[PDB]
Amino acid sequence: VYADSFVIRGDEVRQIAPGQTGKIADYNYKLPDDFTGCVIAWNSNNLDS
Amino acid sequence: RFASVYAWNRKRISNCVADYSVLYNSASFSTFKCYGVSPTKLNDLCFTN
Amino acid sequence: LARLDKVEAEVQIDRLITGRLQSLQTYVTQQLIRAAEIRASANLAATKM
Numbered sequence: 195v196y197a198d199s200f201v202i203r204g205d206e207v208r209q210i211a212p213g214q215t216g217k218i219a220d221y222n223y224k225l226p227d228d229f230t231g232c233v234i235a236w237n238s239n240n241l242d243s
Numbered sequence: 244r245f246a247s248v249y250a251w252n253r254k255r256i257s258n259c260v261a262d263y264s265v266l267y268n269s270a271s272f273s274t275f276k277c278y279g280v281s282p283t284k285l286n287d288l289c290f291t292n
Numbered sequence: 293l294a295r296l297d298k299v300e301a302e303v304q305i306d307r308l309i310t311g312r313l314q315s316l317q318t319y320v321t322q323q324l325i326r327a328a329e330i331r332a333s334a335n336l337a338a339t340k341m
Contacts, residue, residue: 215283
């Protein structure tokens with residue numbers, strides 16, 4: 195298992211899925227077409243702002 | 244000023260060379276959903292009108 | 293292929309692949325039945341010879 199982690203805007207979380215496109219998907223973190231995994235996210239305003 | 248949606252505006256665009264990458268690259272759009280045409284290949288494609 | 297991104301171009305092409313495979317296997321079957329008819333006229337033509 196490979197665990198990946200990062201912070202993004204709450205608007206941008208929609209890009210973290212297979213077959214998505216956009217600045218994050220295109221140039222920051224690209225998922226393959228046949229991705230087997232799970233995408234976990236939570237609001238971190240109190241943590242990261 | 245934009246149209247009221249009950250009176251939605253329309254204009255024909257024709258006899259020109261596009262660059263939809265300018266639109267795709269711009270950050271302000273909160274939605275960019277393309278149906279039956281895909282936003283990347285959109286800039287490689289060509290249309291009558 | 294000129295118009296759609298891979299992840300959904302696959303879905304459109306999968307329809308053409310199913311339809312064209314079903315089209316072709318129907319032709320192949322009807323040729324096997326026709327071949328089983330001409331074979332019986334070739335066995336009769338050989339017998340009359």
